[PDB]
Design a protein around this ligand. Structure first.
Ligand SMILES: Cc1cc2nc3c(=O)[nH]c(=O)nc-3n(C[C@H](O)[C@H](O)[C@H](O)COP(=O)(O)OP(=O)(O)OC[C@H]3O[C@@H](n4cnc5c(N)ncnc54)[C@H](O)[C@@H]3O)c2cc1C
Ligand SMILES: NC(=O)c1ccc[n+]([C@@H]2O[C@H](COP(=O)([O-])OP(=O)(O)OC[C@H]3O[C@@H](n4cnc5c(N)ncnc54)[C@H](OP(=O)(O)O)[C@@H]3O)[C@@H](O)[C@H]2O)c1
Ligand SMILES: Cc1cc2nc3c(=O)[nH]c(=O)nc-3n(C[C@H](O)[C@H](O)[C@H](O)COP(=O)(O)O)c2cc1C
Ligand SMILES: [Ca+2]
Length: 604
């Protein structure tokens, strides 16, 4: 059915929760809200807007007590997720009267970005402009703090508002899927970790994307730093014959595999035979989501390629697990963590989040907790792809995508050693054949259209990644006999003799004349910190001349602190030498952003 309204009528639902999601968080929130409906005598369904036509919103009044909720994540430059693009485009062009429509919006965002929760804000603003009635205030989830707590707090107030407005009242853990063990299946009919189509990893056919990743051979995987302290690496993935295209500035996404050792420990503590092949089937026969991940598959495969077993669990997982803890003290600890406040919340933020306890850690520190592996597989979120800023230029390496990454490994307050999923998996890839499932995601981060336009690149640490590609390209341009403007790199590391990435490559680019200036800040070679913004300030005169002349600024790397400090430094450069007020310099820099002359590729 094309009309979600007709689907709702046919399936007896009065609440529909649409999700704008890229890495599954919004989808999970939408599913959790949909399931909540039953507690109020209502019935809901979650839905991917891309599968429908939101113009059908005007028909919602045909369903009694109809309510629509939107859980929307914001991405690149305050834009909608890919699956919410058509909806976004519709909202911009429509002027339909939505009188009679009742809605609520929960936005997923992160305050370290320039356009915080821009999508949620827009949807909430537009629906009101069109005439719809807001049932509860816009939720502003912030992943820079604790998105989960923002969500359960909003969710609680939301349902209270629903009860008050619709005159309904609140009324044991309900499985969404049922287990079927495939004891006699053909080995060839079993998923072994591929995404989407069965055997798609073995039988590789284009086009390659998120649902059909291209298995690229690792031609190179080399250590970039010295100490055994940290591990920074440079990988080169062969994309020959994939027809995949990219440009410096784009991101490469990879689908990792969890640590075999961690999976084995989970299997043992759960007393489950991980080699058992099974299928989890949706009890709702009318849902397009037939299984929680590719099935049939073994528990080992699911825990290795399909499920997230490392991220500290969200509160609904802990609440559902509580029923399987036989020790009273333990069961109470788990149940309490779903509280939106009080000791339950403090314990969740401290025992789970701050201590970075993953599922095995939780099962180990609550030994009486012994959940059935199949239910656990239904509760855990899907293992997501990780993004890396491509460190190569397609003008120089059209058949290879390079990655510059730092391995994640640290000790927790709970006395454990946590290892980042994608980085440790990538580190273990032996150069030619080791294959990496990947795809390219286009970005707006790009070199200037005119080669003569100067570029100011700021990227300390792994933030230097896209700029290695930028420099390669600018060098290539000069070799093509083209006039290229100044190319400046502001880089930084802790110590020149420990973590100075691409030291020799950058030095050669500078000797060649391709890299006009190589400005490096060594943060730990003095008592006080020396950062890239310190170097930018010292170079204020030249930078202002370039900015005034039309130069493009690029900032890549840490979003929580570096990006903000650097932006503040540029505000000062403009205010001081542009002879304008600080507030005018702020407007100036933000305007450069709208013109594509101040670009960001930051992350946490
Ligand atoms: C658009 C974009 C581009 C990116 N480009 C790059 C790039 O070019 N290079 C690169 O290296 N990375 C890049 N990243 C980060 C990259 O996608 C991964 O998040 C990173 O490699 C870690 O993944 P992982 O699977 O190894 O770690 P995960 O298993 O996902 O674990 C990461 C989490 O571990 C925790 N953590 C890490 N250190 C500590 C500590 N000391 N204490 C407590 N908790 C800690 C944090 O909660 C962190 O979020 C990018 C991210 C985005 C969104
Ligand atoms: O990649 P990666 O994580 O491995 O990078 P990283 O080493 O954590 O950091 C890269 C560089 O950025 C510096 N840095 C830290 N906070 C900063 C800030 N607010 N502004 C500007 N520079 C900052 C670091 O110095 P310090 O780690 O010495 O603070 C380091 O020299
Ligand atoms: C490439 C990228 C860009 C993002 N851009 C923004 C942004 O502009 N504004 C914002 O508030 N949050 C931004 N975020 C944060 C997400 O909106 C937040 O992590 C959300 O929880 C993701 O939901 P999802 O898992 O459903 O896709 C960005 C995240 C990524 C990975
Ligand atoms: Ca200099």
């Amino acid at each position: 059915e094309s009309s979600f309204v007709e689907k709702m009528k046919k399936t007896g639902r009065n609440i529909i929760v649409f999700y704008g999601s890229q890495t599954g968080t919004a989808e999970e929130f939408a599913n959790r809200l949909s399931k909540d409906a039953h507690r109020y005598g209502m019935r809901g369904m979650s839905a991917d807007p891309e599968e429908y036509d939101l113009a059908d919103l005007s028909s919602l009044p045909e369903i009694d007590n109809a309510l629509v909720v939107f859980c929307m994540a914001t991405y690149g430059e305050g834009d909608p997720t890919d699956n919410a693009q058509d909806f976004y485009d519709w909202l911009q062009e429509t002027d339909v009267d939505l009188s009679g429509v009742k809605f609520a919006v929960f936005g997923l965002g992160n305050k370290t970005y320039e356009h915080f929760n821009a999508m949620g804000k827009y949807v909430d603003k537009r629906l009101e402009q069109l005439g719809a009635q807001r049932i509860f205030e816009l939720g502003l989830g912030d992943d820079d703090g604790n998105l989960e707590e923002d969500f359960i707090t909003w969710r609680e107030q939301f349902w209270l508002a629903v009860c008050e407005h619709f005159g309904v009242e609140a009324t044991s853990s309900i499985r969404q899927y049922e287990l079927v063990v495939h004891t006699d299946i053909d080995a060839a009919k079993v998923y072994m970790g591929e995404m989407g189509r069965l055997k798609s990893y073995e039988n590789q056919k284009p086009p390659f994307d998120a649902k059909n990743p291209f298995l690229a051979a690792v031609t190179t995987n080399r250590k970039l730093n010295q100490g055994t302290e940290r591990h920074l690496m440079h990988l080169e993935l062969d994309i020959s014959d994939s027809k995949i295209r990219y440009e410096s500035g784009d991101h490469v996404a990879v689908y990792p595999a969890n640590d075999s050792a961690l999976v084995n420990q989970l299997g043992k503590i759960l007393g489950a035979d991980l080699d058992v092949v099974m299928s989890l089937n949706n009890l709702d026969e009318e849902s397009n989501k037939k299984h929680p991940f590719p099935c049939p598959t073994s528990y080992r495969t699911a825990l290795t390629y399909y499920l997230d077993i490392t991220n500290p669990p969200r509160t609904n997982v802990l609440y559902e697990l509580a029923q399987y803890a036989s020790e009273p003290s333990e069961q109470e600890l788990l149940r309490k963590m779903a509280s939106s406040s009080g000791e339950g919340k403090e314990l969740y933020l401290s025992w789970v989040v701050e201590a970075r306890r993953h599922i095995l850690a939780i099962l180990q520190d609550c030994p009486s907790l012994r959940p059935p592996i199949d239910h656990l597989c239904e509760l855990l979120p899907r293992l997501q792809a990780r993004y890396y800023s491509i460190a190569s230029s397609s003008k120089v390496h059209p058949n290879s995508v390079h990655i510059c990454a730092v391995v994640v490994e640290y000790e927790t307050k709970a006395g454990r050693i946590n290892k980042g999923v994608a980085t440790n998996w990538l580190r273990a890839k032996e150069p030619v054949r080791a294959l990496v499932p990947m795809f390219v995601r286009k970005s707006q981060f790009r070199l200037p259209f005119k080669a003569t336009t100067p570029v100011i690149m700021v990227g300390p640490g792994t933030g230097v990644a896209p700029f290695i590609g930028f420099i390669q390209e600018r060098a290539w341009l000069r070799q093509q006999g083209k006039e290229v403007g100044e190319t400046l790199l502001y880089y930084g590391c802790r110590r020149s003799d420990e973590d100075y990435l691409y030291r020799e490559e950058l030095a050669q680019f500078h000797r060649d004349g391709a890299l006009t200036q190589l400005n490096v800040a060594f943060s730990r070679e003095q008592s006080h910190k020396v950062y890239v913004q310190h170097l930018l300030k010292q170079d204020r005169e030249h930078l202002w001349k370039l900015i005034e002349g039309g130069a493009h600024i690029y900032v890549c790397g840490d979003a929580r602190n570096m990006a903000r400090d650097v932006q503040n430094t540029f505000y000062d450069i403009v205010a001081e030498l542009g002879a304008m007020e600080h507030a005018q310099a702020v407007d100036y820099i933000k305007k450069l952003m709208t013109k594509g002359r101040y670009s960001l590729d930051v992350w946490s």
